Amino acid sequence: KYLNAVEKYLDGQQNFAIRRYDNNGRALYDINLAKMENPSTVQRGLNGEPIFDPFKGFGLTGNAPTDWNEIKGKVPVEVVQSPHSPNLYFVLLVPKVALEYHNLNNQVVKESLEVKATQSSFNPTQRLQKDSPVKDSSKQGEKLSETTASSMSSGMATSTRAKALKVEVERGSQSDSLLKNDFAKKPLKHKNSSGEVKLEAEKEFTEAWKPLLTTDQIAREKGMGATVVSFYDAPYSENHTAFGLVDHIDPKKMVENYPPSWKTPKWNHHGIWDYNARNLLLQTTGFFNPRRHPEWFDEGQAKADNTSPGFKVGDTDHKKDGFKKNSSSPIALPFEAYFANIGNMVAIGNSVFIFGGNGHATKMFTTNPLSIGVFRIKYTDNFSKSSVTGWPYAVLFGGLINPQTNGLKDLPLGTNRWFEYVPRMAVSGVKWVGNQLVLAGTLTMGDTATVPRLKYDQLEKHLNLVAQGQGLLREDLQIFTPYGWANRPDIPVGAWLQDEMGSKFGPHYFLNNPDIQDNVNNDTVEALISSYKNTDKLKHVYPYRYSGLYAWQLFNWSNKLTNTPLSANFVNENSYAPNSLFAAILNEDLLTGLSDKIFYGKENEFAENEADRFNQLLSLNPNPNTNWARYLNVVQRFTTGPNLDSSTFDQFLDFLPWIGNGKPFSNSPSSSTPLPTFSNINVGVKSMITQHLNKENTRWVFIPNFSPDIWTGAGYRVQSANQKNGIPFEQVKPSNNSTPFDPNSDDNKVTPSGGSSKPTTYPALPNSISPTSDWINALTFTNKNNPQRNQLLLRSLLGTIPVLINKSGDSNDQFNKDSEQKWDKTETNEGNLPGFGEVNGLYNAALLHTYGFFGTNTNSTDPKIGFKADSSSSSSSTLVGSGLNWTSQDVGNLVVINDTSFGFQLGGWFITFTDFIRPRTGYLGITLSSLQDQTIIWADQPWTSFKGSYLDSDGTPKSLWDPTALKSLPNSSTTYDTNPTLSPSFQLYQPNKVKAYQTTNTYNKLIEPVDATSAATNMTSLLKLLTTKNIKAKLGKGTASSQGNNNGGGVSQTINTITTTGNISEGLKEETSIQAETLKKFFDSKQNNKSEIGIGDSTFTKMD
Amino acid sequence: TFLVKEDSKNVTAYTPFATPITDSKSDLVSLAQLDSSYQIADQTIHNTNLFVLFKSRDVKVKYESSGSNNISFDSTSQGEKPSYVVEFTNSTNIGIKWTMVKKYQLDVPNVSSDMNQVLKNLILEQPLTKYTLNSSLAKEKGKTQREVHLGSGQANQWTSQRNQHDLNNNPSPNASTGFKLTTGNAYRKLSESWPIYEPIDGTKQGKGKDSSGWSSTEENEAKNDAPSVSSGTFNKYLNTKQALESIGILFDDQTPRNVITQLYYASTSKLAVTNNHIVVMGNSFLPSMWYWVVERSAQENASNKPTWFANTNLDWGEDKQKQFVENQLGYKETTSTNSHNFHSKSFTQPAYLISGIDSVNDQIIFSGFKAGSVGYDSSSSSSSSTKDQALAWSTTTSLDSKTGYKDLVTNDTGLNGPINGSFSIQDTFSFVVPYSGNHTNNGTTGPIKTAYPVKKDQKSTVKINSLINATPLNSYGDEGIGVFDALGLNYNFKSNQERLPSRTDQIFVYGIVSPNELRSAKSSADSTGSDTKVNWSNTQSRYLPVPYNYSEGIIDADGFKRPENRGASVTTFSGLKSIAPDGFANSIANFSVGLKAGIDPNPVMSGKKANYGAVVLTRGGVVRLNFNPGNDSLLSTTDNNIAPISFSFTPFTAAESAVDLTTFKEVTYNQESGLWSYIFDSSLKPSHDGKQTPVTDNMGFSVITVSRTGIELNQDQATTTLDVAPSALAVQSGIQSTTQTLTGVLPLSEEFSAVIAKDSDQNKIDIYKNNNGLFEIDTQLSNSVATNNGGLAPSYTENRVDAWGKVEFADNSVLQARNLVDKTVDEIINTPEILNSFFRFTPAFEDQKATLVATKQSDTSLSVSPRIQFLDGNFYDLNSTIAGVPLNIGFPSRVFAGFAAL
C-alpha cells in the first residue's frame, strides 16, 4: 500500500518519455506514455503482419493496448530494436519506485547492518556469535569407532599409527531411520553461556532486513513489476507510432525455472555431515544461505539461519537425521534482486532477452542485489502473441570448463548436477561484438574465503574468518588466518574428538599445518590410506595426515573448473559481491532455440535419504523426459582478466596503479627501499626448490632454468643466511609446551614389507608460509592462488583492498616510517609482516606504503598509520578499508569499440577487453584507463557521478562525469558521533589478537593468535578507522580539502590505443629466468611508459 | 522423397508428409540378385544415385600359413559369399523404383611373401564388448626392464650395468616392458577362433594366447562358470555370446567363425563415395586391417582387392610421432629363423578402429582410433626372460619437456624403449618420468637412452611376432602409468601446465584423402608380389584419451596428484572401478563412431571455396575436424606451440554422456541448415547382458545434434588465418523416446523435421519443431498430419484448422465493392497481388503462407485454386505430385465471374 501511494504521488510530480531523434539529433516526437491520448495497437492481418503504408503509416485499431491502465504510469529505461522485422521496437518499463528506491524512507528500505546508538561504544563483535562448541558429556560414546583391525589383504605395508575410523551407512528397512548413519554421529554441542550460542534469527535480527515486495507480490501486482511492450515506430508517417503486445516480466515464470536443489538452500549434496560441521562451527550451512545472501529470500533475514533446512536435523537419535522434509525458505526473486535483474535488453530473432543490469537500482551500502538469470520473451506468428520465461544463470553457466578461458585456471566457476553454485552478474551489457554475441560485467565466483574450516576449539581467536563464514563480514577476499584450520574441511564431527588432548596430533583431525604432512611414498600410502578399502556401505577417515595451506585447501575443496562440465564436487558458498570480472560469448542460436519451460528431475533433486546419499554419484544419466542439461552449453567462451596465469598474474597486479593516488602497488621506482606487494620477485631471498620436501627430481621439472632458485617472498623462514635454501624440520609442532612433534616415533613411522621402518615426514620444508608465499614446487605450502588473484585484480582496480593496522594516527599511537620499518629484515618482526589477518597473497607493509597510510606517498604530512609487529607484548589489529568507496558492482555501459574489442567503465577505471574475441599470443589482452578527477575518486558514493558511457564517432569510448551529482551519505550522523558509518565499502572487519612476535625466526611457524573476543575495547583508535570518512580525514581527502576542480563537469575518454598497445611478448616467454621474474623485469623497465602497456590516465575535458 | 531403411533388406521412399510411396517398398537384396543370406550395411546418396554396401552372414574365409592364395573364401560349404557394393539409379519416368547400374564385388586381400610371414604368427585380441570390464582389459604386469636386461637377482647394479646395454643414464630400472599373455582377454591367430567367454579379471582368469591350454581345460571351466541361456554364477567369466553377435561377429551354433572371416565381415561395414572412387572401410567395433578402394570404371566381372593398412604410411603429424608409433610394433632385427613382425618387415601401423568414412567435394575424410599393435615373444624355450610377454610400454612425454604441442610430441621420452613408471615429486607423485634428454636432479649427465626390451645376447633366439589389440590401448600393463595414459591424467608441473600426450596410446587418427593418392592406394591393392607403400599426406593424429570423469575416485586432473590417487584402487587397471555412463562397461578404452563430413551453409568471402567441417563422436565429447578448402587440406596455423588447429575436442554434458555410443545407427547432415544429427536406436543393443540376464531396456531411440561453434575460416579479411581450432558442440537434440521402435528421422526442412516410430506394431507419425538445432514436440500439428485417412497426404479439414490451415474466400460481391467491374479477366489474372484480396487465410504454423493461382473459364469468369505452403517448404496445390503419383488432396477450388469485356 505504501508503494502504491508513492506511485500515485509520483504520477503527478514526475514526467518521463522516450523521444525519437533524426539522424542529425533533432527531436521529432515525445511518446509520453502518461500523456499519449487514445493510443491504439497496430491493426494486424491474418498472417500477423502489421498493416503499414509508408506515408499513411501504421493502422490503428482505435482501442488501447492491453494493461494500458496499469502500464501508463511506468517509466521507460531501455529501448531495443529488432534485427529482422522493420519498424519494430521494444521499450522496457519499470515503476517510478525503482527510480526513487534509494530516496524512500529508511525504515522501509533498511540495511543488513545496523549502526545502532553506540551507547556502549562500538565493537564489531557484538553482532557476531563467536563462542565455540564444547564436547557433549552425554553423547561421548557415539564418536566414530577406530577400525578394529586393518585388513591386510596382501597390503604388506604396516603402520603402527592409529587406525582409520569407520563411516558405515546402510538403508536397512526402517521408514524414517537408518540401520547405520555414521556420517550423522554428533559428539559436539554449542557452548551454553547466557543461552545456547547458535544462529537464530529471532534473537539476533530483531529488525530483520526484508525486501520491499515478495516475488509472488511482484507477479500479482502488475503495476510494480517490469514490463516490455513491443511498439512500432515510423517518424515520417502520419500514424507515426503504434503499440503491439504488452508482456509483464513475471518473476514467477523465473522462479519456476530454478533448479529443485534451490528449494532447500540450507542443504547441499553432502548433507548431514557438512550441515553439522558448519552449524557447530557457527558457519551458516547450505550452498546459498540467507544468512549470507538475504536479498533473494522473500522473508529476508527472518529466515537467515540453519533452522528448518529442508532435511530432518537435530533429532535426538542420530540414525533419524538425514531425511527430506518440508522446506520454507527457497531461493526467490524479491524486489531488489528483481530490479537488479531488469536491464540491458538484447533482441535475437523473434525473441528478446533481458539479461539484467548492474543492480545499482537497489544496491544499498551493505546489500548487493545482482542479476541472477536471463529473462526471455518469445514472439510467435510474426509478433502477434508472446510467451514470457526466464532461466537462472546457474543452469546456463554449468558448461564452463578451463579449456575455454585463456586467463586464470582452476577458478571457482564450476557447478555440478545439483546447481548449488549460484552465479549472478552485475551486467555491464550484452552486445554483438562483430558477429560474436558478448555478455560482460562482473560475476560472483563460488566462495573461496571460507573453504578452510576452523577447529572446533579455535573460533575465539579467528574472529575475522568466523565472521566471514557467519555473514556478518560481507568480505570476499581471503583472510590469511591459517593457525586454527582443521586438517581437512570435510572431516565429520564424528572424528573431531578422537584426540581431545591433542598430544597425539590426531591423524584424522589436527590443527592444519603442512610441516607435518605425510610423504607420498608407496609404502606410506599403502600402509595408511589404500589399506582401508571402502565399500558401498563403508567409507574411512584415513589416518594419513592430510594438511596443506590455502592453495591446497582450495585445490581440494573449491568448485574449481575442470576439463569437463558439471564436475565440481565441492561447492562451499557463493561470493557476496561480484569478485571477478566476466565476459562471455553466448550461443545466440541455442538461446533462441531453447524451450521456455525447464524440466529437472531426480538427478537434480538432492538424495532423499542418507542411504542413497552415501553412494551418490557425481554424474547420473538424465531422465529421458528431462531437458535441463540442454541449457548447459550457452557459454562459448569466457575470460576474467588479462590472458596470464600463475605468478605472472600477480606480477601484472604489481604493475597496475592505485587510483587513490596513482602510485603503483609495487613502488618500484625507488637499502631498505619499499618492496612490491603482490609479486615476490626481488622480495626476500632466493631458495632452491631442489632442497624442499623429498629433495628429489625437481632440478628441471618446475623451473626450466638450470638454477631453480625461487624468491621466497616476504615473511620467509631460514636457519641462517648460510642455509637460505630449504629449511629443515625445526618447525616441530608441540601440542602443549610438551616437546617437539617428535618424528621417528613409532606413531609417525611406517613398516614396509619386511619391517624396515622409516619416518613419514619430509626432511626439509619450503622457506615460507607467509600470506604472500608462492611455491610452484609445493602446492601444499603455497598460498597464492588464482581465485585470490582474480578478486585481487577486481578489488585493486576498484581500489578498496583492505589493510591490517596496529597503530592509528593518534598521539602516542603513531607508527613511524623511519627507525621502525626495515624492509631489509622481512624475516624478523622489523619487517612488520603480520602473518595473521592480512589479505592473502599480498604484503601488508607494501600495501600500506602504496596507500600512504605511512609516509608522504598520499599526504603531504605522514599520516603515521601502520602495522607494527610488537615483540614486547601481545598485539591486536583490525582490517580497514582503503579510503575509497568504489564497489565491485560499479560497472557501466558495455560499449563495443570495433569488430574485435569491447569495454565498459569499472569503478574509476575504463576497462577494454582488447583480446577476448580473437586473442593474440603474447598480449595481456586488457587496456585500462584511470579516472583523473580526485573528487570522484575519493567521493563517498562515486558511482552516482557516472552518467553513462558510449562510443564516440572518433572511435574512442567516453564516459560522462558530473562531480555535482554525488549523493552524500543519508544524514550527518543525525546529531551524534556514529562510530560505524555505513558506506558501500564498509565492512565489519573483526579484531585479531596475536601473540608476541619472536625477535628472531619470526615466521618459522604459523603466527599463533589468542582469544580476541575481549580485545575490541582496547583498540578504539583503530576501530575508529573502520569508517571511510575517518581514513579520508587522516589522508586529507576528508572534505573539499581535496580541492581541484570545484564543479568540473566534463567527459573522460580512454587512452588512445594502437596495434602494438598491450604487447608484452617480450615480458612473457622464458630464456634465462622464470616467467614471473622476467615479466617483473619487463614491467620495471617500463615504469615511465605505462601507456604502451595499456595503463594510463583517462583524458578528461570540461563541459559546462 | 526421403529414402529410409524399412529393415535389414527393405528400403522405401517416404514423402515429406511422412508417408511411404505406394509400391515403393523394394527388396534391394533380391534386386541385386543376392540370396536372402545377404543384408545391407550402409547406404549413401551421391548425384541422386543410391549406393549400398552388402554383407552376408554366410561368408566364410580361411587363412593358410603356406601357399599363395592364403586368404580366400570357403567355397567347400557354399560359404563363398563376398560382399558387394552396388550403384542404384531411379530409372523410370518419375517414381521411386531402383534398378541395377553397376555391381562391384570386394575380394579378400592378397598377401605378399612378406605380409604372410607377419600374418602367420599374428594373433588378434578378442573384440571389445559392450559388457567388457576394466579388469577384463587388464593384463598382469610383465617383466621389468631390469629383469629383462640384467636378469633377476642382479639388483643395485643398474647404474654400473646399464651402459653396455645402450640404456645410458636410464632412470627407471623398474620400468615395465609390457604384459604377460599367459592370461587375460583371449588372443587368437587369424586362422583360429575367439571364445564367447571373457575373463572378468585379466590378471588371473583367461588363458590369453595359449589356445591349446584354453581349449584343454580353461574353456570348460569358463563354460562351467558362465552358461548360455539364469543358472550361472559368473565368479570368474562372462558369457558374452549375445554381445559378440550383436556387434557383428558371425557364429556357428555357438562358436564364432575364424578370425580372418570375422575381420573381413567387420571391414565390410562402411561406405563412402566419390565421382571417381568408392572406398569401403571397417566399423568401429573391432580393428580392420584392410580397406577397399573401388574404381567406378572397373569392369563388372573383375575383382576389387583392398589395401593393407600396413601399406598406408599415414602422416601422424610429425615424423617423431610417426616413428614413435612404428617403433612399438616389434623388434627390428629379429632374423631368428623366421620371427618377423610389422616393424621388421618395414610396415606401419597395421590396425585402426575406423570411426567412420565420408566424402565431400570429391574428397574423402577418414577418422578413427589407432588400434594397438605390439610385439610379443613366442620362444617357448633355456627360455628367454621375456617369454610369453607382450613388448609394450607407455610413451608419455616427460615432465621436463619444453611446453608447446610440437615440443611435447617431439620429446624423445620412450622413443625406443620403456622409461616411465613410478616417481616421487616433492609433495606429490608423477607416474611420468620427470626428465628427458640429458637432465637429472643434479645437472647434466648426458643424453638419456632407451632401447627395445630384448636382451642383446639372445638376439638370435628371441622369436618376436606382432599382435593386434581390440582397443586403442597399446600397453595393457596393470600399472599406474598405463592407467594415467588411458585416462589422460598426466600433467606437467611448470607454470604453463599442459597435458603430456601418450604418443602411442589412445591415439586418434584423422585426415583427408584425395583421388591423387586414392589412385596410389588402388595401385597398392593391385600390387602383385611384393607389397607397395601408400603415402597419405593430409592426415594427422591427436592423443584423445577417455575422460577422467568416467572412473570412480579420479575427481579431477592436475599436475598435483592427491596422495590417495597412489592407492592401488586407482593405480591399476584391475582395481579401476568404472562409472562409464555411455553404455560401455569399461572406462579405460576410448571409442569413436559416426564420422560425417559437411559443407558450411553460411556465406564466405568471394573467391574462397565454402568451408566444410567433419564431426566424429567419441566417448565423452565431440571431435571436429577443420579443413582448408582453398587447398582441400587440414587447416593449420604457423605457430607450432599452438595445438594442431585441425583438431578440436569439446567435452560432453550428462545428457550426451548418457547416450549409449554402441547404438549408433545413422548420421544425417542438413546441408541447408548446417547441423549434423546422430540418431541412436536402442534396438541395436544385444539381447542378454554379459551375465546372461535379458536386457531390460532394448526399446527406445535418441538423437544428438551437433552444431558448429567458434570462428570459421575465410569469414572476413581478418579471419583468413585462424589460431583457434573451430570447435563443435553436441546437445541432446530433443527427439528421444524409450518406448518406441524408431524407423527413421526425416530432415523435412529448416524449421521442422519428422520421425517415424512404431509403438504397437503399427506405424505412427509425430513431427518436431526444429528450433535452430534443437527439437521439441508440437502435438497439434502431429495429429493433423496423421489424419491421412490412409491417403498419401493429409486431407484438408474444411471445417477445422489443420496442417493446411483454414482458407475463407471473399464473396463475389467484393468485385463490386472494390470496383473491379472495369477490370478484365486477363487483367486480374496478371495481378496475383490483387488475387490476394479474394481470400483470407489462417496459417497453421509460423512463416506458413497461401496464395491463389487462377485460370480462365469464360470471357467473364475464371477458375482459381489455392496454393499452400507446407511444413517442408514446398507449395502444394491441385497439380501437386510427389515422384509422379498425384497427391489428390482435394482443395476447395473456386470460380468467380463478373468481369467486363474490356
Coordinates of C-alpha atoms in Angstrom, one line a residue, chain A residues 248-390:
Chain A
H248 CA 5.0 -8.3 -17.9
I249 CA 8.3 -9.9 -16.9
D250 CA 6.7 -12.3 -14.5
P251 CA 9.1 -13.2 -11.6
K252 CA 7.2 -16.5 -11.1
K253 CA 8.0 -17.5 -14.7
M254 CA 11.6 -17.1 -13.5
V255 CA 11.4 -18.8 -10.1
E256 CA 9.6 -21.8 -11.7
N257 CA 12.9 -22.4 -13.6
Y258 CA 15.1 -22.6 -10.5
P259 CA 16.8 -26.0 -10.0
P260 CA 14.9 -28.0 -7.4
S261 CA 18.1 -28.0 -5.3
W262 CA 17.4 -24.3 -4.7
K263 CA 14.1 -25.1 -2.9
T264 CA 16.3 -26.1 0.1
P265 CA 19.4 -23.8 0.1
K266 CA 20.3 -24.6 3.7
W267 CA 21.3 -28.1 2.5
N268 CA 23.8 -29.4 0.0
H269 CA 24.6 -32.7 -1.7
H270 CA 27.0 -33.5 1.2
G271 CA 24.1 -33.1 3.6
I272 CA 24.1 -34.2 7.2
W273 CA 27.8 -34.2 7.8
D274 CA 28.7 -30.8 6.4
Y275 CA 25.5 -29.3 7.8
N276 CA 26.5 -30.4 11.2
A277 CA 30.1 -29.3 10.8
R278 CA 29.0 -25.8 9.7
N279 CA 26.3 -25.5 12.3
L280 CA 28.7 -26.3 15.2
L281 CA 31.4 -24.0 13.6
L282 CA 28.8 -21.2 13.5
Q283 CA 29.3 -21.0 9.8
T284 CA 25.9 -20.9 8.1
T285 CA 25.0 -24.1 6.3
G286 CA 24.0 -24.9 2.8
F287 CA 25.2 -23.5 -0.6
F288 CA 23.3 -20.3 -0.7
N289 CA 22.2 -19.1 2.7
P290 CA 20.0 -16.2 3.6
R291 CA 22.5 -15.7 6.5
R292 CA 24.9 -14.6 3.8
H293 CA 22.6 -13.6 0.9
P294 CA 19.4 -12.2 2.3
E295 CA 18.4 -10.4 -0.9
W296 CA 17.0 -13.4 -2.7
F297 CA 14.6 -14.6 0.0
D298 CA 11.0 -13.3 0.4
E299 CA 11.3 -13.3 4.2
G300 CA 14.9 -11.9 4.0
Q301 CA 17.0 -12.3 7.1
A302 CA 14.0 -13.6 9.0
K303 CA 15.0 -17.0 7.5
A304 CA 18.7 -16.3 8.0
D305 CA 19.8 -19.3 10.0
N306 CA 20.2 -23.1 9.6
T307 CA 17.0 -24.0 11.3
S308 CA 14.4 -25.8 9.1
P309 CA 16.9 -26.6 6.4
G310 CA 14.5 -28.8 4.4
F311 CA 16.0 -32.0 5.8
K312 CA 15.5 -33.6 9.2
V313 CA 18.3 -32.5 11.6
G314 CA 18.9 -32.2 15.3
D315 CA 17.0 -35.4 16.1
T316 CA 17.6 -36.9 19.5
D317 CA 18.6 -40.1 17.6
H318 CA 21.4 -39.6 15.0
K319 CA 20.1 -42.5 12.9
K320 CA 16.9 -40.5 12.3
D321 CA 18.7 -37.4 10.9
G322 CA 19.0 -37.0 7.2
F323 CA 15.6 -37.3 5.6
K324 CA 13.9 -34.9 3.2
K325 CA 11.2 -32.9 4.9
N326 CA 9.1 -29.7 4.3
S327 CA 11.1 -26.6 3.3
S328 CA 10.0 -23.0 3.8
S329 CA 12.9 -20.8 2.6
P330 CA 13.6 -21.5 -1.1
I331 CA 15.5 -19.1 -3.3
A332 CA 13.2 -16.5 -4.8
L333 CA 13.3 -13.2 -6.7
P334 CA 12.2 -10.3 -4.4
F335 CA 12.0 -6.7 -5.3
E336 CA 15.7 -5.8 -5.1
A337 CA 17.1 -8.8 -6.9
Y338 CA 14.3 -8.5 -9.5
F339 CA 15.0 -4.9 -10.4
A340 CA 18.7 -5.6 -10.4
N341 CA 17.7 -8.3 -12.9
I342 CA 15.8 -5.9 -15.3
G343 CA 18.1 -4.2 -17.7
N344 CA 20.3 -4.5 -20.8
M345 CA 17.9 -5.9 -23.3
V346 CA 19.0 -7.7 -26.4
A347 CA 16.9 -8.8 -29.4
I348 CA 17.7 -12.0 -31.3
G349 CA 15.4 -13.4 -34.0
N350 CA 11.8 -13.5 -32.8
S351 CA 12.7 -13.4 -29.2
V352 CA 14.0 -10.6 -26.9
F353 CA 16.2 -11.2 -23.8
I354 CA 16.6 -9.2 -20.7
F355 CA 20.0 -10.0 -19.2
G356 CA 19.6 -7.7 -16.2
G357 CA 21.7 -4.8 -15.0
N358 CA 24.4 -3.9 -12.5
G359 CA 21.9 -3.8 -9.6
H360 CA 22.6 -0.2 -8.6
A361 CA 18.8 0.5 -8.9
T362 CA 18.6 -1.2 -5.5
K363 CA 22.2 -1.6 -4.3
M364 CA 22.5 -0.2 -0.8
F365 CA 25.6 0.1 1.3
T366 CA 25.6 -3.4 2.9
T367 CA 23.4 -5.3 0.3
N368 CA 24.3 -6.4 -3.2
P369 CA 21.5 -7.3 -5.5
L370 CA 22.5 -8.8 -8.8
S371 CA 21.1 -10.3 -12.0
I372 CA 20.5 -14.0 -11.1
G373 CA 19.4 -15.2 -14.6
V374 CA 18.2 -14.4 -18.1
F375 CA 14.6 -13.4 -18.9
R376 CA 13.3 -14.3 -22.3
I377 CA 10.2 -13.3 -24.2
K378 CA 9.5 -15.2 -27.4
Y379 CA 7.1 -13.9 -30.0
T380 CA 5.0 -16.1 -32.3
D381 CA 3.3 -15.8 -35.7
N382 CA 5.2 -12.6 -36.6
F383 CA 5.0 -10.7 -33.3
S384 CA 1.3 -11.5 -32.6
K385 CA 1.3 -13.4 -29.4
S386 CA 4.2 -13.9 -26.9
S387 CA 5.4 -16.1 -24.1
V388 CA 7.5 -14.9 -21.1
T389 CA 10.0 -17.0 -19.3
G390 CA 13.4 -16.8 -17.7

